[PDB]
Amino acid sequence: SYVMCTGSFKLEKEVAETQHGTVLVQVKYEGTDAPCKIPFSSQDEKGVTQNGRLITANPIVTDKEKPVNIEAEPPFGESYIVVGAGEKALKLSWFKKG
């Protein structure tokens, strides 16, 4: 098994909807423990954790220099996508139309 990435993540480019209707976040890893398992979570409008919304199976960083695509299935309305662990976690707001 991989160890959970202990480092920080940043956005490589704008978060966007995919051809199949999911939401893709492409991240650039800033740590030094790759290959490592990406911590991921989703939150509702109130910042409360909601499970089962990660589409990508077992997202990993294999090389710190290579960005990683991560897809989520957010709920309609306001929510957050969170990449990484701790307070340093990359927290992205998302609004899903209709």
Partner: antibody, heavy 117, light 108 residues
Framework: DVQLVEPGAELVQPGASVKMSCKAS????????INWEKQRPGKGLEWIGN????????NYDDKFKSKATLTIDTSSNTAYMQLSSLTSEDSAVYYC??????????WGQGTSVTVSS | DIVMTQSQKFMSTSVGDRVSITCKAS??????VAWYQQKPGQSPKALIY???NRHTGVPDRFTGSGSGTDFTLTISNVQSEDLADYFC?????????FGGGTKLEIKR
């Protein structure tokens, strides 16, 4: 009559690059995604990546990240794919196709790339 | 990445029979599976979308079924124009991946 026209073939020297086109007609170009695929005899079809003409959103299969570049010319309803530093492993039929929530529906005629000196 | 397995590279049939072509996903892809028909020197033609929906113009001989990992393209009353290559595609997540194909041939 939705159509996607690609040139029939391209002969490329080993180490050179190639740029191929996909011209769409019969539908609103900016309302649908474009997919690019690689088909070689003996090997399963591969998805290279996709691009959304209205926004410029682009996604790649990591297997083709160093090889392919997907661009657009929305004023002429055309999608482009550029392949860099070609080897014999790059000889294949390259298809473009219209996409969306229901996946590829209409496929182009394919561009046959031959890598040879 | 998701792997789409078509265990049968070739299948033999007779005109008027039923043939079932299988496609197995390596993970749960729900119903995000399309089926395509391809003849030599021609571009693929879309047959089924979202596992079980028939594209406009496609004969009712063609039906798709399954959800999760096990998908099947069923061709009832096989016609000689149905002799072709058939392949599946998952579009549940990137990268999209295709089955290796199954070629339908005539028994003699």
């Amino acid at each position: 009559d939705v159509q996607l026209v690609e040139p029939g073939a391209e002969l490329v020297q080993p180490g050179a690059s190639v740029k191929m086109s996909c011209k769409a007609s019969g539908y609103t170009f900016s309302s649908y995604w474009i997919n690019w695929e690689k088909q070689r005899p003996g090997k399963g079809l591969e998805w290279i990546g996709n691009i959304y003409p209205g926004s410029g959103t682009v996604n790649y299969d990591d297997k083709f990240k160093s090889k392919a570049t997907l661009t657009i010319d929305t004023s002429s309803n055309t999608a482009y794919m550029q392949l860099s530093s070609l080897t014999s492993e790059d000889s294949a039929v390259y298809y473009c196709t219209r996409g969306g929530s229901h996946a590829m529906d209409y496929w182009g005629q394919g561009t046959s790339v031959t890598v040879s000196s | 990445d998701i792997v789409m397995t078509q265990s049968q590279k070739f299948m033999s049939t007779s005109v008027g029979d039923r043939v079932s072509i299988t496609c197995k996903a390596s993970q749960n892809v729900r119903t995000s599976v399309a089926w395509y028909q391809q003849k030599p020197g021609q571009s693929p033609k879309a047959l089924i979308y979202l596992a079980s929906n028939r594209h406009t113009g496609v004969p009712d001989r063609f039906t798709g079924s399954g959800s999760g990992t096990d998908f099947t393209l069923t061709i009832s009353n096989v016609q000689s124009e149905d002799l072709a290559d058939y392949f599946c595609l998952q579009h549940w997540t990137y990268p999209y991946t295709f089955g290796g194909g199954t070629k339908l041939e005539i028994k003699r």
